[PDB]
């Protein structure tokens, strides 16, 4: 019924070359199952973990998703997510700036 | 200042095979202190604050049963709400429920909360006067009779005025080096050329707890919504939160701008503007 | 502390 936001982004203010933690923040989806990737140029990062499933007062759900990383002049980090919602899985490109 | 403790259940109907996904978390204000997730190896209630973890065995015998059983709970209601609203047994289904209570800044009592929803959408609720229901439709309308012929009101009531106040009160006691220290936002301004004649101002707020927080963009001291952009609060992953706000002015005009940063953990408001 | 189940709906 609802599709996700999703918001991706560092932990901390990035730097090239210093490790940190890339987080991808989907929320205001319903139901709750959801499948969420953290991508280092195109391919699926395998270390990823996420928070325990909760939800706001509108009963849309939330969940971070997490893995460490280091920012660099190279990569591209990304999210994405597929969803019931979705006709396509969704992908939002990191922006250090975001 | 203000403090609240929460629960928020969730069970999720597996047609296919098996019972429903069942996750349990718990909240003292914006920190989570213990989950049960089904698919997880325990079985059992599991501490997620220091805090918590010097609670003795009796505690967490006692939290595992009594999610648990709310686990057991919510299955059958799955397919009870199956049969209210005559559907197949072959689609997944969703129940929630989250109750908790909010104490003041003399943690003394000041509301307690109860309700459940049905995918997504408001079943049933306790009012705030912990005597009367709120049901959505016809549905819920059976199930609140069914509840006032159990006195289930009365048992909430007293959970949420006693329990539930008393065992908060507790946590922050034992998490006071945390639950009842405020971190201020660490704030910030970034400059982003979009022309040779415009750019976005982005005012950040970092590394803050609790959650709660006001950005506000003004020009010339009047508050401006106008070309600016508002994140979602977000969790930076390591128990904080972050924020942002953009706007977007006319390159040189800089100065008529100020970002004003509201937060528990700040005395007065901040004011920034770009350097 | 979590409260004890209610009666099911
Ligand atoms: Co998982």
Same mark, same amino acid.
């Given at each position: 019924?609802?599709?996700?936001? %999703?918001?991706?982004?560092?932990?901390?203010?990035?730097?090239?070359?210093?490790?940190?933690?890339?987080?991808?923040?989907?929320?205001?989806?319903?139901?709750?199952? %959801?499948?969420?990737?953290?991508?280092?140029?195109?391919?699926? %990062?395998?270390?990823?973990?996420?928070?325990?499933?909760?939800?706001?007062?509108?009963?849309?759900?939330?969940?971070?998703?997490?893995?460490?990383?280091?920012?660099?002049?190279?990569?591209?980090?990304?999210?994405?997510?597929?969803?019931?919602?979705?006709?396509?899985?969704? %992908?939002?490109?990191?922006?250090?700036?975001? | 200042? =203000?403090?609240?403790?929460?629960?928020?259940?969730?069970?999720?109907?597996?047609?296919?095979?098996?019972?429903? /996904?069942?996750?349990?978390?718990?909240?003292?204000?914006?920190?989570?202190?213990?989950?049960?997730?089904?698919?997880?190896?325990?079985?059992?209630?599991?501490?997620?604050?220091?805090?918590?973890?010097?609670?003795? $065995?009796?505690?967490?015998?006692?939290?595992?049963?009594?999610?648990?059983?709310?686990?057991?709970?919510?299955?059958?209601?799955?397919?009870?709400?199956?049969?209210?609203?005559?559907? =197949?047994?072959?689609?997944?289904?969703?129940?929630?429920?989250?109750?908790?209570?909010?104490?003041?800044?003399?943690?003394?009592?000041?509301?307690?909360?109860?309700?459940?929803?049905?995918?997504?959408?408001?079943?049933?609720?306790?009012?705030?006067?912990?005597?009367?229901?709120?049901?959505?439709?016809?549905?819920?309308?059976?199930?609140?009779?069914?509840?006032?012929?159990?006195?289930?009101?009365?048992?909430?009531?007293?959970?949420?005025?006693?329990?539930?106040?008393?065992?908060?009160? /507790?946590?922050?006691?034992?998490?006071?080096? +945390? &639950?009842?220290?405020?971190?201020?936002?660490?704030?910030?301004?970034?400059?982003?050329?979009?022309?040779?004649?415009?750019?976005? &101002?982005?005012?950040?707020? !970092? =590394?803050?707890?609790?959650?709660?927080?006001?950005?506000?963009?003004?020009?010339?001291?009047?508050?401006?919504?106008?070309?600016?952009?508002?994140?979602? +609060?977000?969790?930076?992953?390591?128990? +904080?939160?972050?924020?942002?706000?953009?706007?977007?002015?006319?390159?040189?005009?800089?100065?008529?701008?100020?970002?004003?940063?509201?937060?528990?953990?700040? $005395?007065?408001? &901040?004011? !920034?503007?770009?350097? | 502390?979590?409260?004890?189940?209610?009666?099911?709906?």
């Amino acid at each position: 019924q609802r599709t996700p936001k %999703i918001q991706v982004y560092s932990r901390h203010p990035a730097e090239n070359g210093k490790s940190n933690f890339l987080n991808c923040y989907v929320s205001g989806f319903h139901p709750s199952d %959801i499948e969420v990737d953290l991508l280092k140029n195109g391919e699926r %990062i395998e270390k990823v973990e996420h928070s325990d499933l909760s939800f706001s007062k509108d009963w849309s759900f939330y969940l971070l998703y997490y893995t460490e990383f280091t920012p660099t002049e190279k990569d591209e980090y990304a999210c994405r997510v597929n969803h019931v919602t979705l006709s396509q899985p969704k %992908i939002v490109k990191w922006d250090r700036d975001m | 200042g =203000s403090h609240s403790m929460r629960y928020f259940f969730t069970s999720v109907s597996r047609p296919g095979r098996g019972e429903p /996904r069942f996750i349990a978390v718990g909240y003292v204000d914006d920190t989570q202190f213990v989950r049960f997730d089904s698919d997880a190896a325990s079985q059992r209630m599991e501490p997620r604050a220091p805090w918590i973890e010097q609670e003795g $065995p009796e505690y967490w015998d006692g939290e595992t049963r009594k999610v648990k059983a709310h686990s057991q709970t919510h299955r059958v209601d799955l397919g009870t709400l199956r049969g209210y609203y005559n559907q =197949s047994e072959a689609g997944s289904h969703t129940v929630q429920r989250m109750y908790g209570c909010d104490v003041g800044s003399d943690w003394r009592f000041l509301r307690g909360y109860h309700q459940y929803a049905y995918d997504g959408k408001d079943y049933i609720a306790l009012k705030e006067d912990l005597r009367s229901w709120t049901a959505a439709d016809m549905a819920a309308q059976t199930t609140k009779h069914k509840w006032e012929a159990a006195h289930v009101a009365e048992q909430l009531r007293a959970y949420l005025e006693g329990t539930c106040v008393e065992w908060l009160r /507790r946590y922050l006691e034992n998490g006071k080096e +945390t &639950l009842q220290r405020t971190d201020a936002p660490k704030t910030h301004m970034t400059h982003h050329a979009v022309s040779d004649h415009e750019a976005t &101002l982005r005012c950040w707020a !970092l =590394s803050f707890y609790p959650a709660e927080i006001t950005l506000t963009w003004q020009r010339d001291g009047e508050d401006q919504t106008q070309d600016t952009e508002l994140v979602e +609060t977000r969790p930076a992953g390591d128990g +904080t939160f972050q924020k942002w706000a953009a706007v977007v002015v006319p390159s040189g005009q800089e100065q008529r701008y100020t970002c004003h940063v509201q937060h528990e953990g700040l $005395p007065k408001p &901040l004011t !920034l503007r770009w350097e | 502390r979590v409260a004890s189940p209610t009666s099911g709906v």
